[PDB]
Design a protein around this ligand. Structure first.
Ligand code: NI
Ligand code: NI
Ligand code: NI
Ligand code: NI
Ligand code: NI
Ligand code: NI
Lengths: 552, 101, 100, 552, 552, 100
């Protein structure tokens, strides 16, 4: 028969050409494609399509998926498309048309008796976020982050210790082992960073051999040219990544010195703007280099009216570090693609549950201030949406060598997915899936007749329990630890994943964020210029994804 | 401004295009209501619905997926059917075919 | 008191409403969580008073008007549901389009 | 010497002939027997009986019980008697006279150095409830249920997924395995139901072989004659139970068709009244058959003034499903013994912590409306109490083949017991014991000088912790899974139990609830008649076990 | 250069000669020594000392500590000194001067890449408390106790059972095994006490062989001469300790009889004052004997205006037990060293989180009432501080044979440490470290930019999680259980420790509390006299460490 | 309401302040936790009202004076820090020497 577009959207979600506003921002996305056959969409419920002999077939478990997300609107770095998602064995099986081949056409995702269903019509589905700047100050951070849509956390720490408060470092074999064991209790994928500040290579190899997937060089432990060179030498031979928080005091040299010490070798620069740490006042110039993978921490994102005021006491010379000129420019550099990742810097000048939220706030503020990106096609912000989502998903995954397991909705990757209602996109998820099982979601009155009655607040699900958790999360290890049998020795219960490809990623590899601007910072005025033109922006007085959604 | 609002473009969507269809007059002779879903093999619906079962073989209701048509007791009406696709193999329902066709 | 998990959970709802109740009093336009909390806590008291499910379904739509809440909020709340112990046991009250 | 009856009751609890009101209901129970020897009762405390050489003897651990519940008033399907209960190795050792054979007479339960004591004088002790209609929407349900007095939960689900919201089904091997692993974390005995809606037997055998103890046929997945027949064929050969939620739409046939498809084979019918699902408007007629084991979900129990009003939006044709005529009759059918079990239907039209509470509310409303049962002897409601307690204990256990492990206070059964104060019977337990260890109980201020100061609220005890929990709970498996080594393969840590006898139970086997009425439903008026007489009842405006006990 | 003393204290904490007030009490401590080299103190942070090549050296993990607590002011039974503390492999490595031997002098604690840092300057560090009078009524007690600064808990119970409410006894093999398994879930070191009231030795040996490290003789189970003798005979041969709660009723004999039954054998007397239980009214006279190790429970500490009033209903003849004369004297006996330990008596006439707090309150009240101890040297309360801290740390450890593992800050002992801010000493810890990992600490807003924003309340850290917990806690076993393979049989996951030296400790072994007074109690007046002089004190109307720190 | 862990945690702070607010009203001199709770809850409301971080840093020092709190308390609180959702997102407010 026929059906009007409005009623169709109400029943199966939007289709090609329809636009959807992201939360309460000014960003609009438009469906680029729909992988269905009109009339053959699958729907669950009394009298619907997914019933024996109809939308559900007769195949055995081996020939059908374990889970199907129906009528999902995917937003990923590669596209904004409408499709069914199939999950099998904890991984993304396919993106296409679900159903029963016996009576339906174009079925690429077979639904059988062994298939569970999540109705995603009217919902936006994304990969789980990846935060690579975690300070393990307390375990409660994993729940906060998971609830926000972040499924992988990389960083270092031992708890509320002075070392960890300041640096993302898990110092030495003993603490590393202890933290690898504690990680099986947390519902997120975890990778650890050791202390890279030493001029003795063997002291670094021990930590890698013990289990760390990276090394953090921090000025508090001494970000000297010697220590930097030593860490990068070990990284080169052990295929682990290096994260840097440079010498703010310019004690051992200026920025050009650090860059020289690095010597064109791959390195992830933390909070490249400078407020969070780094050569004052020009550490931001690092984003011009091909070997530097630049990221921002979240408190400076985006530039608002109270930003500067709150930053002094949070620091606790401050004026050399907290610069309005570089803070204003950072937002633009993100819009242009010069800054490739966003991260938190949890409880050490960063908010753990605000990585995703703040990234969208920057995109919004840039659309309002600068208009459409030169790359936009059509009357939508599709490209700007792909550029920004890549910042907390695929790019972080590439920078740390875990893109082979997580980072995006592509076949064969771990099924770490987040379901969002368009009105709450980037703010409060409808469902957070880890390794194919729901791990946390909003849940109403436990004793109620339905799951919707108040009070509704996030509560841990079966995917966050005992052995089911162990089966749905990954603990990342360096290739060395993996070979030395660390997992068996510490008796780790979770699935193991090895990092690789940390030395070969370069700026050009960052999805939609590969710009290397000819950037300069004025030593006196602190003004940031690209090709001589001044880069700057205005501070927001009010932002979306804020007072309309939070109780406090 | 309305959070997460749609901006659906106007028009319509043509369903099940390129497929055989046929119209059938159906009458409920039972004393209780009967409701049929979009993808149910029509030839195997509740025995109380009187119609040409032979014509409805390998067909289902030509209505949007997941919706249904109801027949109150004594109700008579004409529905449009669309043929099954895929392998055209019927399994389940009242167990009358259980195989291709 | 021998409080069961559901009773303790409801103390969370009650408390969220005290927050919203105070802000409303200051003359602020309520946001999403505050609105849901206020109307919900009102229904729980209706049941403690012995009002019927039918009466509460109607009264619940007169707690907050569109002029007392932030923009977009009314659309974010198509309905509000909450259960409480009525004289005849626990019942569910659904208030459709509570804010107008 | 001599002692007056009132003082005796105050010191050791009531004896033969004494009556006790159940909570604030009109139901009174009378002690039918007392297994003590007056003067030789055991009591614990300073200067009491249970002391070395006196009430406590010299035997080794092997010759005495690990726990003794003293002076308990047992209420079970077989009797309402006063006695000491002995627990040994996590199981019910004996019901009789506890003490020391050296100086006391008639001792059948030896108390020694290895014996712990729970003072049960003045308290009512019952078996733990068994809910066979669980939707695993969230893990928090186990705590809610445990607190209410339910110790075994059978059902299906994967969490807050559309499939699970609607049906009690754990679809396929992968989810089944995942949920079996997650179950070791929950403090209740658990058995899982897979998706039975398929016309391919092998797709069902896989699920049974994977671990499910039953199969749920649900109309949302297609409750067709073919699918029904297929599930029952597999059940017959694998000794697992089938639970049914029939075709409400009458799409594949009317009720007589479904019944014909069943073909006299054993089947557990869920929410047999119809509101929760089933052939409209006469699915209730199923309770007339010998092979049908009928149960009710709890929101319609009992018929009250707000019942009909709340049921429409909870459904979300409604009028064909929500019928005052069948809802009013259901209460009576329970009183008569035509309906044999009560269950919740947790968060899918049912309240998880109200199975026990609502069952007693029905008994009360029926006593008030219909008076004494024809079976009553004496001026008490003893028989009506036995008929109703059987509904959420022994009968559910028989229907699902687990009566050999749990379901009642009989020797050799797992020690899943609930201690109640008469004023809070059926509402708030004093102690919930799992496998011989207290798992949850009301607990006052942790820092207080005694355990009674406010605030008192339910908190998890040692029986709900790590390995102690694993040792005190059971995970039920199908005989097939048990043989295939599923427990070892998934590395389940809890005790394992196998279900058996699911195909041989019939209506006649339901304790005190075996009536097969000649029931008819009027197609037009919806009136329920038994032998031509109209079955009906009036709705309550106020109920016991409600506003006097809850804060909200 | 030079630096003034005030600025020095602000930067590195106090040094030799400086005095610090303990919380809001009148007790002042004075630094007795400083193990640093002025100018070479280690400090962490941007531009500080602990940086590569500087305060941090080039040694491998094996040649440096895993953790260093910098500039700590240690208060232990052996001294009040300023020093850096080194922790390696979960144990106290050294107390001395931390740093890098390459450029610094007198370094005894090498800091390398594998070293984490806890800034302790301005903070007081102590050993974790040890409570040997725990009633395992609920598991929540471990968190309450841990937060207060107690890291080891010894006692008995099975949960909220009548036996456990009254006595610290885990009756028999089954419960003992169950509780040993449950203990891996608790973040404190645990040792269990079985029921010692039997006149059959084999019934006692079974319990020891099963895992208990001691036996509790309690009047509720019959504290008869026969039972007492039997327990002490087994203790003598199995090297386990006995704790006693004597016959209050004087039913089998008076105090002199019990003492005779004991026959000069080692025994730990619980609540030796009498209120908590014991021969009325003179059980207090036990502290005169060389084989008696006397302890007090905390509700009577210290004597205040509401003490007597609250004690009657808490008891629930009362007048024979609750005596103002003995309660007033107890405080003095502690000040003199006649009473050697303080404990709680958790939820059975004792407050679990108030052992440390109340011990300091007694010291304060005694300083105010009696002035300086005869042993004091200098204008400080150093000796009184050492005498009192020993009461809940080293002495309890010696009495129960675990002093080889825990009890004080000495090399080779498990690193169970508590960091305190001077303003909150004894009330609310800044950090509680178990086996070298922080297990609990105050933590602000999880989503905040720093860990300090409100609300700040105690939350579990990584040292309290899964396997990391198992690695940082100890389960104590009797030598017999250890040899019989109980740990492997029950599959205990935590580190195992064996008790030894329980039969050889005597009053003379109690650190700073070894007085054996010629004490007498008047049968009629209840007055306590030592050498004829009346011992007594006045009740406090207001105490420190109370209303200024608590919300309720 | 879909409350996140941080929102529920803040209900704890709000509630501690109701306790302190009542006691202050009775004429009692506040102790340490009560004082921290009162000033903190005041800041969270300032943000809900839309006051700037700069303004709150100053106003926060005028909620309680040294005569309204127990002895030693002012010295136990060198500063008070709390975060809340301002119109422009979450911000941190540090109030130095709030009690004088
Ligand atoms: Ni940094
Ligand atoms: Ni950082
Ligand atoms: Ni159902
Ligand atoms: Ni159900
Ligand atoms: Ni005692
Ligand atoms: Ni005790």
């Amino acid at each position: 028969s026929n059906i009007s577009r409005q009623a169709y959207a109400d029943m199966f979600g939007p289709t090609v050409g329809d636009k959807v506003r992201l939360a309460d921002t000014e960003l609009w996305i438009e469906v680029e494609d729909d992988l269905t056959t009109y009339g053959e969409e699958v729907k669950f419920g009394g009298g619907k399509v997914i019933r024996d002999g109809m939308g559900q077939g007769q195949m055995l478990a081996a020939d059908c998926v374990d889970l199907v997300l129906t009528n999902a609107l995917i937003v990923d770095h590669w596209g904004i498309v409408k499709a069914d998602i199939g999950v099998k064995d904890g991984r993304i099986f396919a993106i296409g048309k679900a159903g029963n081949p016996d009576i339906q056409p174009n079925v690429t995702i077979p639904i059988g008796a062994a298939t569970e269903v999540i109705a995603a019509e009217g919902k936006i589905v994304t990969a789980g976020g990846i935060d690579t700047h975690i300070h393990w100050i307390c375990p409660q951070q994993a729940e906060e982050a998971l609830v926000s849509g972040v499924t992988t956390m990389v960083g270092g720490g031992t708890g509320p210790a002075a070392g960890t408060h300041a640096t993302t470092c898990t110092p030495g074999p003993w603490y590393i082992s202890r933290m690898l064991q504690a990680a099986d209790s947390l519902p997120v994928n975890i990778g650890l960073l050791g202390k890279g500040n030493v001029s003795q290579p063997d002291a670094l190899r021990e930590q890698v051999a013990a289990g760390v997937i990276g090394l953090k060089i921090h000025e508090d432990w001494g970000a000297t040219p010697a220590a930097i060179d030593c860490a990068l030498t070990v990284a080169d031979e052990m295929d682990i990544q290096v994260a840097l928080h440079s010498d703010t005091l310019n004690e051992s040299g200026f920025v050009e010195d650090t860059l020289a010490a690095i010597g064109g070798r791959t390195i992830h620069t933390f909070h490249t703007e400078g407020a969070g740490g780094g050569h004052a006042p020009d550490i931001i110039t690092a984003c011009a280099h091909p070997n530097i993978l630049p990221s921002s921490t979240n408190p400076t994102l985006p530039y608002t009216l109270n930003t500067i005021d709150e930053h002094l006491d949070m620091l606790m010379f401050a004026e050399s570090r907290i610069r309005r000129e570089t803070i204003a420019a950072e937002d633009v550099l993100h819009d242009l693609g010069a800054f490739s990742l966003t991260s938190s810097d949890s409880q050490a000048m960063g908010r753990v549950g605000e990585v995703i939220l703040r990234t969208w706030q920057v995109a919004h503020r840039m659309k309002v201030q600068r208009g459409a990106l030169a790359e936009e096609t059509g009357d939508n912000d599709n490209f700007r949406v792909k550029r920004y989502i890549a910042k907390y998903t695929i790019n972080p995954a590439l920078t740390h060598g875990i893109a082979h397991e997580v980072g995006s909705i592509e076949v064969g990757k771990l099924a770490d997915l987040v379901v969002w209602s368009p009105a709450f996109f980037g703010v409060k998820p409808a469902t957070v899936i880890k390794g194919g099982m729901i791990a946390i979601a909003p849940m109403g009155d436990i004793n109620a007749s339905i799951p919707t009655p108040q009070p509704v607040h996030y509560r841990p699900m079966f995917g966050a329990l005992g052995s089911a958790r162990h089966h749905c999360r990954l603990t990342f290890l360096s290739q060395a630890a993996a070979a030395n049998g660390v997992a068996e020795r510490l008796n780790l219960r979770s699935a193991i994943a090895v990092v690789k490809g940390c030395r070969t990623v370069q700026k050009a590899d960052m999805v939609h964020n590969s710009l290397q601007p000819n950037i300069t910072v004025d030593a006196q005025t602190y003004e940031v210029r690209v090709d001589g033109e001044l880069i700057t922006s205005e501070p927001a007085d009010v932002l979306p994804m804020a007072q309309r959604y939070f109780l406090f | 401004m309305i959070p997460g609002e749609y901006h659906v473009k106007p028009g319509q969507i043509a369903l099940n295009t390129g497929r055989a269809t046929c119209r059938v007059v159906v009458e409920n002779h039972g004393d209780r209501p009967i409701q049929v879903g979009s993808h149910y093999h029509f030839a195997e619906v509740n025995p109380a619905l009187k119609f040409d079962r032979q014509q409805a073989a390998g067909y289902r209701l030509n209505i949007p997926a997941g919706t249904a048509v109801r027949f109150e007791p004594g109700q008579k009406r004409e529905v449009e059917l669309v043929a099954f696709a895929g392998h055209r193999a019927v399994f389940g329902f009242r167990g009358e075919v259980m195989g291709p066709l | 008191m021998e409080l069961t998990p559901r009773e303790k959970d409801k103390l969370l709802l009650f408390t969220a409403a005290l927050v919203a109740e105070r802000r409303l009093a200051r003359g602020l336009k309520l946001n999403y969580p505050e609105s849901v909390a206020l109307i919900s806590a009102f229904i729980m008291e209706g049941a403690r008073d012995g009002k019927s499910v039918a009466s509460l379904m109607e009264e619940g739509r007169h707690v907050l008007t569109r002029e007392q809440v932030m923009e977009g909020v009314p659309e974010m709340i198509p309905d509000i549901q909450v259960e409480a112990t009525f004289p005849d046991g626990s019942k569910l009250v659904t208030v459709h389009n509570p804010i107008i």
